Amino acid sequence: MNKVHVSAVGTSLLKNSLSADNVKKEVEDLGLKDWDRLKFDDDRQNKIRDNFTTLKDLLLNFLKSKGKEASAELDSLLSAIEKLQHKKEELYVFLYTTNTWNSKLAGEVIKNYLEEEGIKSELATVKSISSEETFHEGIEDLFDKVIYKILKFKEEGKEVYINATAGLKPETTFLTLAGLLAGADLVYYKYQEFNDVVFLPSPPITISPRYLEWLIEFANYGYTLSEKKAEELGIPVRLLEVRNLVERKGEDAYRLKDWVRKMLGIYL
Amino acid sequence: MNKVHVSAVGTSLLKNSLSADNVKKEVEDLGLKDWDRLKFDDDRQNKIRDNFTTLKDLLLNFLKSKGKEASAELDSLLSAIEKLQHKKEELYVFLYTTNTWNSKLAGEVIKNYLEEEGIKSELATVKSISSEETFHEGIEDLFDKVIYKILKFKEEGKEVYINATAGLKPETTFLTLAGLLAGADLVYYKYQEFNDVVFLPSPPITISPRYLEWLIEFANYGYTLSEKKAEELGIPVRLLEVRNLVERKGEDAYRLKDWVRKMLGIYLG
Ligand SMILES: Nc1ncnc2c1ncn2[C@@H]1O[C@H](CO)[C@@H](OP(=O)(O)OC[C@@H]2O[C@H](n3cnc4c(N)ncnc43)[C@H]3OP(=O)(O)O[C@H]32)[C@H]1O
Ligand SMILES: Nc1ncnc2c1ncn2[C@@H]1O[C@H](CO)[C@@H](OP(=O)(O)OC[C@@H]2O[C@H](n3cnc4c(N)ncnc43)[C@H]3OP(=O)(O)O[C@H]32)[C@H]1O
């Protein structure tokens, strides 16, 4: 499993499944008209979870019937697999879901259809998902997770590939950004009407040395202090939390991020 | 300009317009069923351009009727304007279209509706737009363009804001990347079901200094190389600088990119 593909999950499966006669009528029954595009904290979202198993089994049938094209995730993923001739025994897939039932719905179906096709997969959820003042914290968190993963698998000697096709815009923007930073092998994308997948350009991108110099000596100073003696050799730590490089959590607010610490170590 | 907003334009307007009874039937008449989602080099795309004025006038009516919500671009843009209370007088808005008739159709309608609302706007077209082996060159080109605007207005002392909402995924990803690099004030995004726009987090990001130091030394020798002096200070031009930093390279000569030349100047040299 030395070929890992990371992807977001969206609601493509939901929206494409309203083509199926059986699905449109069963969904229309539960009153789930626009179930692919609803507010993250919508009443219709609870409808999806109490019927979750009912809907999960319906979409498996639609996904087996339609194949690749039923969903953005599977369409782009399997286009890329055949393009790059990846073996299923040497293959691993990471699906990130959001904290919404339509996203976990699509995630669960895609995970099942992959393991049925003979492809190992793993689900995951950025729990920090709603709009009001949490959405920015959510993409912050998903960025922190993906970038750590990419370094971890890259240390083992995995070939990491990034499916930037599916999920919300910011979700996909950060998945390519983290890939560029953590040195992923490829970032691919496939538009609905493309024949096969296309590879995005990769600029050589790093954390700005202005902040990076203070991160070097952050670890050396026992990391976390007060105000003056925390800025004791020139560490603006509130500035560091604003640029999402350090975490506060409590009173003092001195917690070097787990990816940041690991990325400094790759000056060898 | 005193608060500049750059955006991509997609086929949101086209897709949302098939709600209108007049639009659905007139579009269905021209056989433009899925006109929001067609291959960039599709026959249906020519259908759009010979009826362009007919369709341009139809969508103006729909856009005046619906307002903001008729398109992603206008919905996210005007949500941001009211959020950040930009006085209409000082606004300038930069819409990039792709090289497809549906996109320029959307663009033209949006340009007209903005100038009618009292907002200065300007169209643009990334001409290198098709799938086969041109799409990566096209987003390379859009990235080259949108980098420049950010540097220009930021040097003048005007603020700059990026609408990462609209257009294809790569188009929006590189619009935010450029913003992050060239030091734009904000990058905002609005999901179709959000109340108003949300501001994306900002890691402090630049081009890695290991490549940056090789790019400074390329500049000093007037660009366009092949061999012998191809690794004179440690510059692999068809290998490491084939990561989109050098143009052509494998055919004719190996020249450096017009954005990277201007970016070495903007980072103090
Ligand atoms: N008036 C407007 N008309 C049309 N679009 C508008 C308008 N105002 C704003 N927009 C937004 O503008 C972007 C242009 O398309 C859209 O944001 P985008 O990131 O593209 O979201 C679209 C899809 O939402 C899906 N997905 C919705 N929930 C979730 C969710 N909770 N987890 C993951 N994916 C989700 C994503 O997965 P997928 O493969 O099907 O594509 C995306 C629109 O939501
Ligand atoms: N089996 C599949 N089912 C569903 N979606 C699939 C599938 N395989 C791939 N996808 C893609 O995955 C994303 C959603 O799952 C989509 O790609 P995305 O880049 O998000 O397309 C989004 C919209 O394309 C539109 N726009 C189509 N033309 C053009 C064009 N020529 N200039 C600009 N924008 C264009 C834009 O309108 P806007 O404001 O609402 O947002 C974009 C789909 O094309």
UniProtKB/TrEMBL annotation, chain A:
Q: Which domain of life is it from?
A: Archaea
Q: Where is the SSO1393-like winged-helix domain?
A: 209-267
Q: Which residues form the CRISPR system ring nuclease SSO1393-like domain?
A: 68-202
- The protein here is known as CRISPR-associated protein, APE2256 family
Q: Which organism is it from?
A: Saccharolobus islandicus (strain REY15A)
- State the taxonomy lineage: Archaea, Thermoproteota, Thermoprotei, Sulfolobales, Sulfolobaceae
